[PDB]
Amino acid sequence: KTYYMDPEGSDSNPGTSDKPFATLVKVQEVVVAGDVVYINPGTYVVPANQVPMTTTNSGLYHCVFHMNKSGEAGKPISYLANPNKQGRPIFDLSQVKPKDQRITVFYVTGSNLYLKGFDVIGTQVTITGHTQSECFRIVKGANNNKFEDLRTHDGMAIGFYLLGGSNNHILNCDAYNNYDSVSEGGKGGNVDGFGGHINSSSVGEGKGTGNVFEGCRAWYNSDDGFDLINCFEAVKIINCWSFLNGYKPGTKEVAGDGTGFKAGGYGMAADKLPAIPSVIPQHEVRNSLAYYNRLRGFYANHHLGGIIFESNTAVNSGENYNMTNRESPLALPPTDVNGYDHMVKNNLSLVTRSGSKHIVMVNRAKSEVSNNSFDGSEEVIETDFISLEEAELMRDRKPNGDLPDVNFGKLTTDAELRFWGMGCF
Ligand SMILES: C[C@@H]1O[C@H](O[C@@H]2[C@H](O)[C@@H](O)[C@H](O)O[C@@H]2C(=O)O)[C@H](O[C@H]2OC(C(=O)O)=C[C@H](O)[C@H]2O)[C@H](O)[C@H]1O
Numbered sequence: 001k002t003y004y005m006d007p008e009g010s011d012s013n014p015g016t017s018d019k020p021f022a023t024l025v026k027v028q029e030v031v032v033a034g035d036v037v038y039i040n041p042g043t044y045v046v047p048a049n050q051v052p053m054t055t056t057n058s059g060l061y062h063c064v065f066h067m068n069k070s071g072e073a074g075k076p077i078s079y080l081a082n083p084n085k086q087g088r089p090i091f092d093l094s095q096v097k098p099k100d101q102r103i104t105v106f107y108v109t110g111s112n113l114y115l116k117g118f119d120v121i122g123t124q125v126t127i128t129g130h131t132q133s134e135c136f137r138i139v140k141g142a143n144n145n146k147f148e149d150l151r152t153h154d155g156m157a158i159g160f161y162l163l164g165g166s167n168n169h170i171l172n173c174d175a176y177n178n179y180d181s182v183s184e185g186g187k188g189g190n191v192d193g194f195g196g197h198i199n200s201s202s203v204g205e206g207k208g209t210g211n212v213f214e215g216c217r218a219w220y221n222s223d224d225g226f227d228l229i230n231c232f233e234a235v236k237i238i239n240c241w242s243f244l245n246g247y248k249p250g251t252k253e254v255a256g257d258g259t260g261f262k263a264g265g266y267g268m269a270a271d272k273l274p275a276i277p278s279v280i281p282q283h284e285v286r287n288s289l290a291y292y293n294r295l296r297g298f299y300a301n302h303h304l305g306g307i308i309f310e311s312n313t314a315v316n317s318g319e320n321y322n323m324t325n326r327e328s329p330l331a332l333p334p335t336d337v338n339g340y341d342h343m344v345k346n347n348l349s350l351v352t353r354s355g356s357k358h359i360v361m362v363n364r365a366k367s368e369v370s371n372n373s374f375d376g377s378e379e380v381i382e383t384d385f386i387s388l389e390e391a392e393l394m395r396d397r398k399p400n401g402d403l404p405d406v407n408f409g410k411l412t413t414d415a416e417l418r419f420w421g422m423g424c425f
Protein backbone atom coordinates (compact mmCIF):
# COMPACT_ATOMS: atom_id res chain seq x y z
CA LYS A 1 0.00 0.00 0.00
CA THR A 2 3.00 2.37 0.28
CA TYR A 3 4.53 2.96 -3.20
CA TYR A 4 7.88 4.60 -3.90
CA MET A 5 9.39 6.58 -6.81
CA ASP A 6 12.88 7.86 -7.57
CA PRO A 7 14.77 9.87 -10.24
CA GLU A 8 17.12 6.83 -10.71
CA GLY A 9 14.06 4.50 -10.76
CA SER A 10 12.15 2.32 -13.25
CA ASP A 11 8.43 2.00 -14.12
CA SER A 12 9.06 -1.68 -14.92
CA ASN A 13 9.82 -2.11 -11.17
CA PRO A 14 7.01 -3.07 -8.75
CA GLY A 15 7.38 0.30 -6.93
CA THR A 16 8.83 -0.89 -3.60
CA SER A 17 11.52 0.63 -1.38
CA ASP A 18 14.33 -1.52 -2.81
CA LYS A 19 13.04 -1.15 -6.41
CA PRO A 20 10.84 1.98 -6.93
CA PHE A 21 8.82 3.62 -9.76
CA ALA A 22 10.05 6.54 -11.95
CA THR A 23 6.95 8.57 -13.00
CA LEU A 24 3.57 9.57 -11.59
CA VAL A 25 1.94 8.18 -14.78
CA LYS A 26 2.74 4.64 -13.63
CA VAL A 27 1.65 5.64 -10.09
CA GLN A 28 -1.73 6.73 -11.45
CA GLU A 29 -1.97 3.33 -13.23
CA VAL A 30 -2.06 1.45 -9.83
CA VAL A 31 -3.24 3.56 -6.81
CA VAL A 32 -6.59 3.31 -4.97
CA ALA A 33 -8.21 4.81 -1.85
CA GLY A 34 -5.94 4.54 1.25
CA ASP A 35 -2.58 4.09 -0.48
CA VAL A 36 0.46 6.27 0.02
CA VAL A 37 3.16 7.26 -2.50
CA TYR A 38 6.57 8.23 -1.11
CA ILE A 39 8.28 10.41 -3.71
CA ASN A 40 12.04 10.27 -3.06
CA PRO A 41 13.89 13.63 -3.08
CA GLY A 42 15.81 14.92 -6.12
CA THR A 43 15.20 16.33 -9.60
CA TYR A 44 12.70 14.52 -11.84
CA VAL A 45 13.03 15.96 -15.36
CA VAL A 46 9.82 15.27 -17.31
CA PRO A 47 10.88 14.21 -20.88
CA ALA A 48 10.17 16.58 -23.77
CA ASN A 49 8.30 13.81 -25.62
CA GLN A 50 6.28 12.47 -22.60
CA VAL A 51 2.72 12.01 -23.92
CA PRO A 52 0.17 13.88 -21.84
CA MET A 53 -2.17 11.96 -19.53
CA THR A 54 -5.15 13.96 -20.89
CA THR A 55 -6.13 17.21 -22.61
CA THR A 56 -8.91 19.71 -21.95
CA ASN A 57 -10.70 22.48 -23.86
CA SER A 58 -10.51 20.66 -27.24
CA GLY A 59 -6.74 20.09 -27.07
CA LEU A 60 -5.95 23.62 -25.80
CA TYR A 61 -4.04 22.01 -22.87
CA HIS A 62 -1.26 19.43 -22.51
CA CYS A 63 -1.99 17.91 -19.07
CA VAL A 64 1.25 16.32 -17.75
CA PHE A 65 -0.40 14.52 -14.82
CA HIS A 66 -4.15 13.79 -14.67
CA MET A 67 -4.80 13.51 -10.91
CA ASN A 68 -8.04 11.75 -11.78
CA LYS A 69 -8.49 8.94 -9.26
CA SER A 70 -10.01 9.54 -5.84
CA GLY A 71 -9.64 8.50 -2.22
CA GLU A 72 -12.60 8.07 0.13
CA ALA A 73 -13.76 10.00 3.20
CA GLY A 74 -11.21 8.95 5.86
CA LYS A 75 -9.15 7.03 3.26
CA PRO A 76 -7.17 9.47 1.06
CA ILE A 77 -4.60 8.85 -1.67
CA SER A 78 -1.39 10.52 -0.49
CA TYR A 79 1.45 11.70 -2.73
CA LEU A 80 4.22 12.67 -0.36
CA ALA A 81 7.85 13.71 -0.33
CA ASN A 82 9.63 10.76 1.33
CA PRO A 83 9.88 11.82 5.02
CA ASN A 84 12.82 9.43 5.72
CA LYS A 85 15.14 11.39 3.32
CA GLN A 86 16.57 14.95 3.31
CA GLY A 87 15.64 17.37 0.53
CA ARG A 88 12.65 17.67 -1.75
CA PRO A 89 11.24 16.10 -4.92
CA ILE A 90 11.44 18.56 -7.77
CA PHE A 91 9.50 18.17 -11.00
CA ASP A 92 11.35 20.03 -13.78
CA LEU A 93 9.27 20.79 -16.89
CA SER A 94 11.60 23.07 -18.85
CA GLN A 95 11.75 20.36 -21.54
CA VAL A 96 7.96 20.10 -22.02
CA LYS A 97 7.16 22.45 -24.92
CA PRO A 98 4.29 20.92 -26.92
CA LYS A 99 3.25 22.70 -30.17
CA ASP A 100 0.59 25.46 -29.80
CA GLN A 101 -0.65 23.97 -26.46
CA ARG A 102 -1.02 25.38 -22.93
CA ILE A 103 0.49 23.33 -20.10
CA THR A 104 -1.14 22.08 -16.93
CA VAL A 105 1.34 20.06 -14.83
CA PHE A 106 -1.09 18.74 -12.22
CA TYR A 107 -4.65 18.67 -13.53
CA VAL A 108 -6.90 17.74 -10.60
CA THR A 109 -10.38 16.17 -10.98
CA GLY A 110 -10.19 13.48 -8.25
CA SER A 111 -11.32 13.82 -4.64
CA ASN A 112 -9.74 13.05 -1.23
CA LEU A 113 -6.17 13.53 -2.35
CA TYR A 114 -3.22 14.66 -0.24
CA LEU A 115 -0.17 16.16 -2.00
CA LYS A 116 2.85 17.26 0.06
CA GLY A 117 6.49 18.37 0.22
CA PHE A 118 7.61 18.73 -3.43
CA ASP A 119 8.43 21.42 -6.01
CA VAL A 120 7.26 22.21 -9.58
CA ILE A 121 9.74 24.27 -11.64
CA GLY A 122 10.32 25.33 -15.23
CA THR A 123 6.73 25.14 -16.43
CA GLN A 124 6.64 26.58 -19.93
CA VAL A 125 4.55 28.80 -22.13
CA THR A 126 5.19 28.53 -25.92
CA ILE A 127 2.00 30.26 -27.26
CA THR A 128 2.43 33.90 -28.46
CA GLY A 129 -1.04 35.41 -27.77
CA HIS A 130 -3.41 35.38 -24.80
CA THR A 131 -2.29 32.30 -22.88
CA GLN A 132 -1.34 30.73 -19.54
CA SER A 133 0.10 27.56 -18.10
CA GLU A 134 -0.58 26.17 -14.61
CA CYS A 135 1.29 23.99 -12.18
CA PHE A 136 -1.95 22.99 -10.43
CA ARG A 137 -5.38 23.48 -12.00
CA ILE A 138 -8.46 22.36 -10.04
CA VAL A 139 -11.96 22.10 -11.56
CA LYS A 140 -15.62 21.16 -10.87
CA GLY A 141 -15.73 17.66 -9.32
CA ALA A 142 -12.40 17.89 -7.44
CA ASN A 143 -13.54 17.95 -3.79
CA ASN A 144 -12.06 17.56 -0.28
CA ASN A 145 -8.40 17.76 -1.41
CA LYS A 146 -5.28 18.94 0.39
CA PHE A 147 -2.17 20.52 -1.09
CA GLU A 148 0.52 21.17 1.48
CA ASP A 149 4.15 22.37 1.49
CA LEU A 150 4.17 22.37 -2.34
CA ARG A 151 6.35 25.02 -3.97
CA THR A 152 5.61 26.28 -7.52
CA HIS A 153 8.52 28.46 -8.68
CA ASP A 154 11.03 29.53 -11.38
CA GLY A 155 8.75 28.87 -14.38
CA MET A 156 6.14 30.70 -16.51
CA ALA A 157 2.97 29.11 -15.13
CA ILE A 158 0.41 30.15 -12.55
CA GLY A 159 1.05 28.37 -9.24
CA PHE A 160 -2.45 27.34 -8.25
CA TYR A 161 -5.44 28.03 -10.45
CA LEU A 162 -8.94 27.09 -9.30
CA LEU A 163 -11.87 26.96 -11.75
CA GLY A 164 -14.03 24.69 -9.49
CA GLY A 165 -14.16 22.06 -6.74
CA SER A 166 -15.12 22.21 -3.04
CA ASN A 167 -13.29 22.24 0.33
CA ASN A 168 -9.83 22.17 -1.32
CA HIS A 169 -7.24 23.31 1.23
CA ILE A 170 -4.05 24.88 -0.09
CA LEU A 171 -1.77 24.98 2.92
CA ASN A 172 1.77 26.27 3.40
CA CYS A 173 2.49 26.49 -0.36
CA ASP A 174 4.97 28.94 -1.96
CA ALA A 175 4.48 30.42 -5.43
CA TYR A 176 7.42 32.57 -6.50
CA ASN A 177 9.70 33.76 -9.36
CA ASN A 178 6.99 32.97 -11.92
CA TYR A 179 6.93 35.00 -15.14
CA ASP A 180 5.73 34.42 -18.71
CA SER A 181 8.53 36.06 -20.70
CA VAL A 182 7.35 34.54 -24.03
CA SER A 183 3.75 35.65 -24.71
CA GLU A 184 2.43 39.15 -25.56
CA GLY A 185 5.89 40.74 -25.32
CA GLY A 186 6.58 39.45 -21.81
CA LYS A 187 3.93 41.51 -20.00
CA GLY A 188 3.42 38.55 -17.63
CA GLY A 189 -0.15 39.78 -17.03
CA ASN A 190 -1.60 36.27 -16.54
CA VAL A 191 0.91 34.75 -14.08
CA ASP A 192 -0.48 34.85 -10.51
CA GLY A 193 0.82 32.96 -7.47
CA PHE A 194 -2.60 31.82 -6.38
CA GLY A 195 -5.86 32.19 -8.34
CA GLY A 196 -9.39 31.54 -7.10
CA HIS A 197 -11.78 31.71 -10.09
CA ILE A 198 -14.62 29.31 -9.31
CA ASN A 199 -16.60 29.44 -12.59
CA SER A 200 -20.36 29.42 -13.32
CA SER A 201 -20.42 25.63 -13.83
CA SER A 202 -19.19 24.84 -10.23
CA VAL A 203 -21.57 26.74 -7.83
CA GLY A 204 -23.48 25.13 -4.91
CA GLU A 205 -22.61 23.99 -1.37
CA GLY A 206 -20.33 20.96 -1.73
CA LYS A 207 -19.49 21.92 -5.36
CA GLY A 208 -17.54 25.24 -5.16
CA THR A 209 -17.64 26.29 -1.48
CA GLY A 210 -15.06 26.12 1.33
CA ASN A 211 -11.89 26.44 -0.76
CA VAL A 212 -9.17 28.03 1.40
CA PHE A 213 -5.63 29.34 0.89
CA GLU A 214 -3.71 29.28 4.17
CA GLY A 215 -0.10 29.84 5.22
CA CYS A 216 0.94 30.49 1.64
CA ARG A 217 3.48 32.96 0.27
CA ALA A 218 3.35 34.60 -3.16
CA TRP A 219 6.31 36.62 -4.34
CA TYR A 220 7.84 37.85 -7.64
CA ASN A 221 4.84 36.65 -9.59
CA SER A 222 4.71 38.94 -12.65
CA ASP A 223 0.98 39.74 -12.18
CA ASP A 224 -0.59 39.29 -8.70
CA GLY A 225 0.20 37.21 -5.64
CA PHE A 226 -3.41 36.26 -4.98
CA ASP A 227 -6.41 36.94 -7.22
CA LEU A 228 -10.13 36.11 -6.76
CA ILE A 229 -11.58 37.67 -9.91
CA ASN A 230 -14.49 35.86 -11.58
CA CYS A 231 -15.05 33.77 -8.49
CA PHE A 232 -18.62 32.57 -7.98
CA GLU A 233 -18.29 31.00 -4.50
CA ALA A 234 -16.48 32.55 -1.55
CA VAL A 235 -12.77 31.74 -1.28
CA LYS A 236 -10.86 32.66 1.92
CA ILE A 237 -7.20 33.74 2.23
CA ILE A 238 -5.89 33.20 5.78
CA ASN A 239 -2.40 33.76 7.18
CA CYS A 240 -0.78 34.33 3.78
CA TRP A 241 1.92 36.82 2.64
CA SER A 242 1.95 38.49 -0.80
CA PHE A 243 4.94 40.61 -1.72
CA LEU A 244 6.98 41.95 -4.69
CA ASN A 245 4.34 40.96 -7.27
CA GLY A 246 3.99 43.01 -10.47
CA TYR A 247 7.70 42.72 -11.27
CA LYS A 248 9.97 40.50 -13.34
CA PRO A 249 11.76 38.23 -10.80
CA GLY A 250 14.57 39.70 -8.67
CA THR A 251 14.05 43.26 -10.02
CA LYS A 252 11.83 46.35 -9.84
CA GLU A 253 11.09 46.13 -13.59
CA VAL A 254 7.41 46.61 -14.51
CA ALA A 255 5.34 43.56 -15.55
CA GLY A 256 1.63 42.97 -14.58
CA ASP A 257 -0.91 44.46 -12.15
CA GLY A 258 1.13 44.01 -9.00
CA THR A 259 -1.64 43.42 -6.51
CA GLY A 260 -0.91 41.60 -3.26
CA PHE A 261 -4.50 40.35 -2.84
CA LYS A 262 -7.01 41.06 -5.62
CA ALA A 263 -9.89 39.81 -3.53
CA GLY A 264 -12.89 39.97 -5.88
CA GLY A 265 -14.12 41.55 -9.08
CA TYR A 266 -15.87 40.58 -12.29
CA GLY A 267 -14.01 42.97 -14.59
CA MET A 268 -14.83 46.40 -15.93
CA ALA A 269 -15.45 45.25 -19.50
CA ALA A 270 -16.80 48.21 -21.49
CA ASP A 271 -18.21 46.08 -24.34
CA LYS A 272 -20.37 43.58 -22.41
CA LEU A 273 -21.80 42.55 -19.05
CA PRO A 274 -19.64 39.86 -17.42
CA ALA A 275 -21.31 36.65 -16.22
CA ILE A 276 -21.88 36.69 -12.44
CA PRO A 277 -23.22 34.49 -9.60
CA SER A 278 -26.76 35.20 -8.37
CA VAL A 279 -25.42 35.69 -4.82
CA ILE A 280 -22.23 37.78 -4.73
CA PRO A 281 -19.81 35.84 -2.51
CA GLN A 282 -18.24 37.55 0.50
CA HIS A 283 -14.55 36.68 0.00
CA GLU A 284 -12.22 37.02 3.02
CA VAL A 285 -8.59 38.04 3.51
CA ARG A 286 -7.41 37.55 7.10
CA ASN A 287 -4.25 37.62 9.21
CA SER A 288 -2.31 38.18 6.00
CA LEU A 289 0.60 40.42 5.02
CA ALA A 290 1.11 42.62 1.92
CA TYR A 291 4.50 44.22 1.31
CA TYR A 292 5.95 46.15 -1.67
CA ASN A 293 3.70 44.91 -4.44
CA ARG A 294 3.96 47.12 -7.52
CA LEU A 295 0.61 48.92 -7.14
CA ARG A 296 -1.75 47.67 -4.45
CA GLY A 297 -1.85 45.56 -1.26
CA PHE A 298 -5.39 44.56 -0.25
CA TYR A 299 -7.84 45.33 -3.06
CA ALA A 300 -11.57 44.76 -3.64
CA ASN A 301 -10.87 44.89 -7.37
CA HIS A 302 -14.25 46.24 -8.60
CA HIS A 303 -16.27 43.66 -6.61
CA LEU A 304 -20.10 43.65 -6.80
CA GLY A 305 -20.52 43.39 -3.00
CA GLY A 306 -18.99 42.72 0.41
CA ILE A 307 -15.53 41.46 1.43
CA ILE A 308 -13.81 40.91 4.81
CA PHE A 309 -10.36 42.44 5.36
CA GLU A 310 -9.69 41.67 9.03
CA SER A 311 -6.37 41.81 10.92
CA ASN A 312 -4.06 42.25 7.93
CA THR A 313 -0.79 44.14 7.92
CA ALA A 314 0.14 46.25 4.83
CA VAL A 315 3.59 47.82 4.25
CA ASN A 316 4.66 49.98 1.25
CA SER A 317 2.42 48.17 -1.22
CA GLY A 318 1.16 51.15 -3.25
CA GLU A 319 -2.53 51.58 -2.35
CA ASN A 320 -2.41 49.45 0.84
CA TYR A 321 -6.18 49.15 1.15
CA ASN A 322 -8.38 49.96 -1.83
CA MET A 323 -12.06 49.03 -1.61
CA THR A 324 -13.22 50.05 -5.11
CA ASN A 325 -16.41 48.22 -6.07
CA ARG A 326 -18.36 48.11 -9.31
CA GLU A 327 -21.87 49.60 -9.07
CA SER A 328 -24.89 47.32 -8.65
CA PRO A 329 -26.69 46.09 -10.58
CA LEU A 330 -24.34 45.42 -13.49
CA ALA A 331 -24.45 48.30 -15.99
CA LEU A 332 -22.63 49.59 -19.07
CA PRO A 333 -20.63 51.76 -19.00
CA PRO A 334 -18.70 50.22 -16.08
CA THR A 335 -18.64 52.79 -13.29
CA ASP A 336 -16.60 52.46 -10.06
CA VAL A 337 -18.13 53.44 -6.64
CA ASN A 338 -16.95 53.59 -2.99
CA GLY A 339 -16.81 50.05 -1.55
CA TYR A 340 -20.01 48.71 0.00
CA ASP A 341 -21.02 45.88 2.35
CA HIS A 342 -17.36 45.48 3.51
CA MET A 343 -15.99 44.40 6.89
CA VAL A 344 -12.67 46.29 7.18
CA LYS A 345 -11.32 45.84 10.71
CA ASN A 346 -8.18 45.60 12.86
CA ASN A 347 -5.73 46.25 10.03
CA LEU A 348 -2.28 47.91 10.13
CA SER A 349 -0.77 50.19 7.40
CA LEU A 350 2.84 51.51 7.14
CA VAL A 351 3.36 54.04 4.28
CA THR A 352 6.94 55.32 3.81
CA ARG A 353 7.30 54.61 0.05
CA SER A 354 6.86 57.17 -2.71
CA GLY A 355 3.21 57.21 -3.89
CA SER A 356 1.75 54.72 -1.37
CA LYS A 357 -1.49 55.25 0.63
CA HIS A 358 -3.33 53.83 3.61
CA ILE A 359 -6.96 53.49 2.42
CA VAL A 360 -9.03 54.40 -0.67
CA MET A 361 -12.57 54.09 -2.00
CA VAL A 362 -14.70 52.73 0.85
CA ASN A 363 -18.23 53.85 1.82
CA ARG A 364 -18.29 54.06 5.63
CA ALA A 365 -22.09 54.45 5.67
CA LYS A 366 -22.47 51.12 3.74
CA SER A 367 -19.43 49.20 5.10
CA GLU A 368 -18.34 48.32 8.68
CA VAL A 369 -14.98 50.09 8.99
CA SER A 370 -13.62 49.95 12.54
CA ASN A 371 -10.35 49.91 14.49
CA ASN A 372 -7.80 50.33 11.67
CA SER A 373 -4.42 52.02 12.34
CA PHE A 374 -4.88 54.47 9.47
CA ASP A 375 -8.01 55.86 11.18
CA GLY A 376 -6.27 56.32 14.57
CA SER A 377 -5.12 59.73 15.78
CA GLU A 378 -1.37 58.88 15.51
CA GLU A 379 0.38 58.02 12.21
CA VAL A 380 2.21 54.65 12.02
CA ILE A 381 6.01 54.92 11.58
CA GLU A 382 9.13 52.78 10.94
CA THR A 383 10.28 52.82 14.61
CA ASP A 384 7.03 51.02 15.60
CA PHE A 385 8.40 47.83 13.94
CA ILE A 386 10.92 45.33 15.40
CA SER A 387 12.09 44.56 11.86
CA LEU A 388 11.46 45.69 8.35
CA GLU A 389 14.23 43.53 6.79
CA GLU A 390 12.43 42.02 3.74
CA ALA A 391 14.73 39.02 3.34
CA GLU A 392 13.11 37.53 6.50
CA LEU A 393 9.90 36.98 4.41
CA MET A 394 11.82 34.63 2.10
CA ARG A 395 13.15 32.56 5.05
CA ASP A 396 12.94 28.80 4.54
CA ARG A 397 9.85 27.30 6.15
CA LYS A 398 9.86 25.29 9.37
CA PRO A 399 10.53 21.51 8.83
CA ASN A 400 6.76 20.86 9.11
CA GLY A 401 5.99 23.48 6.41
CA ASP A 402 4.67 26.25 8.73
CA LEU A 403 5.72 29.88 7.91
CA PRO A 404 9.04 30.82 9.55
CA ASP A 405 9.27 33.13 12.56
CA VAL A 406 9.80 36.67 11.30
CA ASN A 407 10.22 40.01 13.09
CA PHE A 408 9.16 41.74 9.85
CA GLY A 409 6.03 43.90 10.18
CA LYS A 410 5.52 42.85 13.83
CA LEU A 411 4.94 45.71 16.28
CA THR A 412 7.10 46.42 19.34
CA THR A 413 5.36 45.96 22.67
CA ASP A 414 5.27 49.78 23.12
CA ALA A 415 3.70 50.15 19.66
CA GLU A 416 1.24 47.26 20.31
CA LEU A 417 -0.41 49.43 23.06
CA ARG A 418 -0.95 52.43 20.73
CA PHE A 419 -2.18 50.10 17.94
CA TRP A 420 -4.02 47.43 20.01
CA GLY A 421 -5.41 44.28 18.36
CA MET A 422 -4.25 45.63 14.98
CA GLY A 423 -2.33 43.78 12.27
CA CYS A 424 -1.59 40.15 11.46
CA PHE A 425 0.75 39.83 14.48
C1 LIG B 1 -11.10 45.92 -14.47
C2 LIG B 1 -9.82 45.60 -13.72
O1 LIG B 1 -8.71 45.84 -14.61
C3 LIG B 1 -7.49 45.56 -13.91
O2 LIG B 1 -6.26 46.29 -14.17
C4 LIG B 1 -6.33 47.67 -14.65
C5 LIG B 1 -5.13 47.78 -15.59
O3 LIG B 1 -5.06 46.63 -16.46
C6 LIG B 1 -3.84 47.85 -14.78
O4 LIG B 1 -2.67 47.88 -15.61
C7 LIG B 1 -3.93 49.07 -13.87
O5 LIG B 1 -2.66 49.28 -13.24
O6 LIG B 1 -4.97 48.81 -12.92
C8 LIG B 1 -6.28 48.75 -13.53
C9 LIG B 1 -7.34 48.53 -12.47
O7 LIG B 1 -8.51 48.93 -12.65
O8 LIG B 1 -7.01 47.94 -11.43
C10 LIG B 1 -7.34 44.07 -13.59
O9 LIG B 1 -7.57 43.25 -14.79
C11 LIG B 1 -6.49 42.59 -15.56
O10 LIG B 1 -5.88 41.44 -14.95
C12 LIG B 1 -6.84 40.43 -14.53
C13 LIG B 1 -6.52 39.64 -13.51
O11 LIG B 1 -5.42 39.74 -12.95
O12 LIG B 1 -7.36 38.71 -13.07
C14 LIG B 1 -8.01 40.32 -15.20
C15 LIG B 1 -8.27 41.11 -16.48
O13 LIG B 1 -8.52 40.20 -17.56
C16 LIG B 1 -7.11 42.03 -16.84
O14 LIG B 1 -7.59 43.05 -17.72
C17 LIG B 1 -8.43 43.89 -12.53
O15 LIG B 1 -8.37 42.59 -11.95
C18 LIG B 1 -9.80 44.18 -13.14
O16 LIG B 1 -10.82 43.98 -12.14
Ligand SMILES: C[C@@H]1O[C@@H](O[C@@H]2[C@H](O)[C@@H](O)[C@@H](O[C@@H]3[C@H](O)[C@@H](O)[C@H](C)O[C@H]3O)O[C@@H]2C(=O)O)[C@H](O)[C@H](O)[C@H]1O
Binds near residue numbers: 132190227
Ligand atom coordinates in the same frame (compact mmCIF):
# COMPACT_ATOMS: atom_id res chain seq x y z
C1 LIG C 1 -10.46 28.46 -23.15
C2 LIG C 1 -11.17 29.67 -22.55
O1 LIG C 1 -11.38 29.49 -21.12
C3 LIG C 1 -12.18 30.55 -20.69
O2 LIG C 1 -11.67 31.82 -20.39
C4 LIG C 1 -10.80 31.99 -19.27
C5 LIG C 1 -11.54 32.97 -18.35
O3 LIG C 1 -12.90 32.54 -18.18
C6 LIG C 1 -11.54 34.39 -18.91
O4 LIG C 1 -12.12 35.27 -17.95
C7 LIG C 1 -10.13 34.86 -19.24
O5 LIG C 1 -9.41 34.97 -17.99
C8 LIG C 1 -8.30 35.89 -17.97
C9 LIG C 1 -7.01 35.12 -17.73
O6 LIG C 1 -6.89 34.07 -18.69
C10 LIG C 1 -6.95 34.53 -16.32
O7 LIG C 1 -5.62 34.03 -16.11
C11 LIG C 1 -7.28 35.55 -15.24
C12 LIG C 1 -7.43 34.90 -13.88
O8 LIG C 1 -8.51 36.20 -15.57
C13 LIG C 1 -8.50 36.89 -16.84
O9 LIG C 1 -7.44 37.85 -16.86
O10 LIG C 1 -9.60 33.91 -20.19
C14 LIG C 1 -9.44 32.60 -19.62
C15 LIG C 1 -8.56 31.77 -20.51
O11 LIG C 1 -8.11 30.69 -20.07
O12 LIG C 1 -8.26 32.22 -21.64
C16 LIG C 1 -13.57 30.55 -21.22
O13 LIG C 1 -14.18 29.27 -21.01
C17 LIG C 1 -13.48 30.87 -22.70
O14 LIG C 1 -14.78 30.73 -23.26
C18 LIG C 1 -12.45 29.97 -23.38
O15 LIG C 1 -12.06 30.64 -24.59
Ligand SMILES: [Ca+2]
Binds near residue numbers: 189190223256257
Ligand atom coordinates in the same frame (compact mmCIF):
# COMPACT_ATOMS: atom_id res chain seq x y z
CA1 LIG D 1 -3.65 40.62 -15.06
Ligand SMILES: [Ca+2]
Binds near residue numbers: 189190191262
Ligand atom coordinates in the same frame (compact mmCIF):
# COMPACT_ATOMS: atom_id res chain seq x y z
CA1 LIG E 1 -3.99 38.32 -11.69
